[PDB]
Design an enzyme around this catalytic site. Structure first.
Site, PDB file in Angstrom:
ATOM      1  N   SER A  46       0.835  -1.203   0.000  1.00  0.00           N
ATOM      2  CA  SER A  46       0.000   0.000   0.000  1.00  0.00           C
ATOM      3  C   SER A  46       0.869   1.251   0.000  1.00  0.00           C
ATOM      4  O   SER A  46       0.344   2.356  -0.045  1.00  0.00           O
ATOM      5  CB  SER A  46      -1.036   0.064   1.118  1.00  0.00           C
ATOM      6  OG  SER A  46      -1.945  -1.043   1.168  1.00  0.00           O
ATOM      7  N   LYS A  49       0.593   4.468  -1.996  1.00  0.00           N
ATOM      8  CA  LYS A  49      -0.524   5.400  -1.836  1.00  0.00           C
ATOM      9  C   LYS A  49      -0.013   6.732  -1.279  1.00  0.00           C
ATOM     10  O   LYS A  49      -0.678   7.776  -1.383  1.00  0.00           O
ATOM     11  CB  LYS A  49      -1.681   4.862  -0.979  1.00  0.00           C
ATOM     12  CG  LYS A  49      -2.318   3.587  -1.528  1.00  0.00           C
ATOM     13  CD  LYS A  49      -2.977   2.762  -0.424  1.00  0.00           C
ATOM     14  CE  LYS A  49      -3.754   1.632  -1.052  1.00  0.00           C
ATOM     15  NZ  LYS A  49      -4.294   0.609  -0.152  1.00  0.00           N
ATOM     16  N   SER A 106      -5.085   4.072   4.101  1.00  0.00           N
ATOM     17  CA  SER A 106      -4.773   3.068   3.103  1.00  0.00           C
ATOM     18  C   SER A 106      -6.031   2.627   2.323  1.00  0.00           C
ATOM     19  O   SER A 106      -6.090   1.534   1.754  1.00  0.00           O
ATOM     20  CB  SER A 106      -4.088   1.911   3.770  1.00  0.00           C
ATOM     21  OG  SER A 106      -3.195   1.360   2.810  1.00  0.00           O
ATOM     22  N   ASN A 108      -8.706   1.576  -0.091  1.00  0.00           N
ATOM     23  CA  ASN A 108      -8.602   1.000  -1.434  1.00  0.00           C
ATOM     24  C   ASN A 108      -9.511   1.694  -2.447  1.00  0.00           C
ATOM     25  O   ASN A 108      -9.087   1.915  -3.578  1.00  0.00           O
ATOM     26  CB  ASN A 108      -8.772  -0.509  -1.436  1.00  0.00           C
ATOM     27  CG  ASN A 108      -7.541  -1.208  -0.929  1.00  0.00           C
ATOM     28  OD1 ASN A 108      -6.422  -0.788  -1.246  1.00  0.00           O
ATOM     29  ND2 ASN A 108      -7.720  -2.248  -0.135  1.00  0.00           N
ATOM     30  N   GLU A 145      -5.193  -6.796  -6.286  1.00  0.00           N
ATOM     31  CA  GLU A 145      -4.348  -7.754  -6.993  1.00  0.00           C
ATOM     32  C   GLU A 145      -2.850  -7.434  -6.848  1.00  0.00           C
ATOM     33  O   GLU A 145      -2.009  -8.328  -6.936  1.00  0.00           O
ATOM     34  CB  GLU A 145      -4.849  -7.946  -8.436  1.00  0.00           C
ATOM     35  CG  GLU A 145      -5.516  -6.708  -9.056  1.00  0.00           C
ATOM     36  CD  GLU A 145      -5.544  -6.508 -10.579  1.00  0.00           C
ATOM     37  OE1 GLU A 145      -5.665  -5.369 -11.124  1.00  0.00           O
ATOM     38  OE2 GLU A 145      -5.434  -7.560 -11.246  1.00  0.00           O
ATOM     39  N   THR A 212       2.607   3.191   5.370  1.00  0.00           N
ATOM     40  CA  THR A 212       2.910   1.776   5.540  1.00  0.00           C
ATOM     41  C   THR A 212       2.330   1.014   4.352  1.00  0.00           C
ATOM     42  O   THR A 212       1.418   1.500   3.704  1.00  0.00           O
ATOM     43  CB  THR A 212       2.318   1.266   6.854  1.00  0.00           C
ATOM     44  OG1 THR A 212       0.976   1.720   6.793  1.00  0.00           O
ATOM     45  CG2 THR A 212       2.910   1.923   8.081  1.00  0.00           C
TER      46      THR A 212
HETATM   47  B1  LIG Z   1      -2.069  -2.146   2.117  1.00  0.00           B
HETATM   48  O1  LIG Z   1      -0.858  -2.443   1.562  1.00  0.00           O
HETATM   49  O2  LIG Z   1      -2.096  -1.318   3.222  1.00  0.00           O
HETATM   50  C1  LIG Z   1      -2.704  -1.911   4.327  1.00  0.00           C
HETATM   51  C2  LIG Z   1      -3.655  -2.936   4.222  1.00  0.00           C
HETATM   52  C3  LIG Z   1      -4.152  -3.515   5.394  1.00  0.00           C
HETATM   53  C4  LIG Z   1      -3.692  -3.119   6.643  1.00  0.00           C
HETATM   54  C5  LIG Z   1      -2.699  -2.163   6.739  1.00  0.00           C
HETATM   55  F1  LIG Z   1      -2.283  -1.794   7.972  1.00  0.00           F
HETATM   56  C6  LIG Z   1      -2.263  -1.464   5.608  1.00  0.00           C
HETATM   57  C7  LIG Z   1      -1.129  -0.458   5.706  1.00  0.00           C
HETATM   58  O3  LIG Z   1      -0.260  -0.650   6.563  1.00  0.00           O
HETATM   59  O4  LIG Z   1      -1.111   0.517   4.944  1.00  0.00           O
HETATM   60  C8  LIG Z   1      -4.178  -3.323   2.880  1.00  0.00           C
HETATM   61  C9  LIG Z   1      -4.695  -2.242   1.975  1.00  0.00           C
HETATM   62  C10 LIG Z   1      -3.400  -2.920   1.630  1.00  0.00           C
HETATM   63 CL   LIG Z   2      -2.045   4.148   5.893  1.00  0.00          CL
END
Ligand SMILES: *[B@@]1([O])OC2=C([C]=[C]C(F)=C2C([O])=O)[C]2[C][C]21
Ligand SMILES: [Cl-]
Ligand SMILES: [Cl-]
Length: 267
Positions: A46, A49, A106, A108, A145, A212
Site C-alpha cells: 500500500s 498510496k 490506506s 482501497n 491484486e 505503511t
Molecule cells: B495495504 O498495503 O495497506 C494496508 C492494508 C491492510 C492493513 C494495513 F495496515 C495497511 C497499511 O499498513 O497501509 C491493505 C490495503 C493494503
Molecule cells: Cl495508511
C-alpha cells in the site's frame, strides 16, 4: 565502522525472522546515508498510496484539478478496506479528502478511483514517479491484486533506496510548492497505520510522517517516513521486508528494530 556493524545487525535480524530486509536512511543535514539491500527489489503493497497523494497534489498545483472538487461514486462496489470512502459514499468526498484517505487509512476505494479518474491508472502512477527521476519504482496492477507479493514477481515493486530518494524529493525537495508541500507534509504526519513501525523507533518528541504497506502475504510489509528531530535536520527512513513462505505473517517489530538500526547508522 558505524556502518559495517549496522549491516551486521540487519543481517542477523533478517535471519532471525527467516526473511529479507531492505533499508535506506538519509540524514538530510549531514548528507549521511545507510543502505542494506537498498537496490534489491521489494513489493510496494500500500506504500505507493503515499506517492499517489503527492501525484494528486502536483496536478492540483498545475490547476488541472481542484483540491475541493467533489468526487462522486454512489453506485460503486467499494473494494475491501475502504474504511473512509464507505462512510461518505452517499455524498462524495473532495479530491483532497480522497487522496489523504488513500494515504492515511490506506483506503482501497480512494486509491482505485483516483488512479482511474485522474492519474492514468498504474501506468500513470509509474509515469509520475519517472517524472521525478525515480527509475526503480513500478506499479503494474490495481487494488487489491497488486498485493500478491509473489517472490521474483517484479510487478508493483521498488527498491528501499529509490523509495527514500523519492520521499526526500516530494516531502523535502522542490517538486511541490510551499503551500501544497505543507498539505502533503500534514497528510503524512496524520498517517494512522504506522504507530508500531518507524514511529516506534524514535523519541516521542520527534514529528514523523509515514506511509505503511502490508501485502498480507509472504510476510511482506514496509514503512517509509520523514522524521523531524527537535534540534536537527529531517531524517528519511525506508524499511522493506518479505518472507520465505506464502503464509508467513508480517513483523511490525522487525520493521521498528530495522528503523532503530538505520537511524543510529546515519547519526
Ligand atoms: B495495504 O498495503 O495497506 C494496508 C492494508 C491492510 C492493513 C494495513 F495496515 C495497511 C497499511 O499498513 O497501509 C491493505 C490495503 C493494503
Ligand atoms: Cl495508511
Ligand atoms: Cl516538494
Amino acid at each position: 565502522n558505524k556502518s559495517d556493524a549496522a549491516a551486521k545487525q540487519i543481517k542477523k535480524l533478517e535471519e532471525d525472522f527467516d526473511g529479507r530486509i531492505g533499508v535506506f536512511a538519509i540524514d538530510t543535514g549531514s548528507g549521511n546515508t545507510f543502505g542494506y539491500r537498498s537496490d534489491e527489489r521489494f513489493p510496494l503493497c500500500s506504500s505507493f498510496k503515499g506517492f499517489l497523494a503527492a501525484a494528486v497534489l502536483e496536478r492540483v498545483q498545475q490547476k488541472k484539478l481542484d483540491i475541493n472538487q467533489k468526487v462522486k461514486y454512489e453506485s460503486r462496489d467499494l473494494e475491501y478496506h475502504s474504511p473512509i470512502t464507505t462512510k461518505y459514499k452517499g455524498s462524495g468526498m473532495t479530491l483532497g479528502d480522497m487522496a489523504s484517505a488513500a494515504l492515511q487509512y490506506s483506503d482501497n476505494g480512494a486509491t482505485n478511483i483516483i488512479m482511474e479518474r485522474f492519474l492514468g491508472g498504474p501506468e500513470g502512477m509509474t509515469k509520475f514517479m519517472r517524472s521525478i527521476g525515480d527509475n526503480e519504482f513500478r506499479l503494474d496492477r490495481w487494488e487489491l491484486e497488486l498485493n500478491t507479493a509473489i517472490p521474483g514477481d517484479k510487478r508493483d515493486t521498488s527498491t528501499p533506496k529509490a523509495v527514500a530518494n523519492s520521499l526526500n524529493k516530494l516531502a523535502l525537495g522542490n517538486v511541490l510548492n510551499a503551500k501544497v508541500k505543507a498539505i502533503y507534509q500534514n497528510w503524512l504526519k496524520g498517517n494512522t497505520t504506522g504507530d508500531a513501525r518507524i514511529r516506534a523507533s524514535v523519541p516521542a518528541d520527534w514529528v514523523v510522517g509515514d506511509k505503511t504497506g502490508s501485502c498480507g502475504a509472504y510476510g511482506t510489509a514496509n514503512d517509509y517516513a520523514v522524521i523531524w528531530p527537535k534540534n536537527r535536520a529531517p531524517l528519511i527512513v525506508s524499511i522493506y521486508t518479505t518472507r520465505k513462505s506464502k503464509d508467513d505473517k508480517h513483523s511490525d517489530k522487525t520493521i521498528a528494530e530495522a528503523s532503530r538500526i538505520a537511524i543510529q547508522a546515519i547519526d
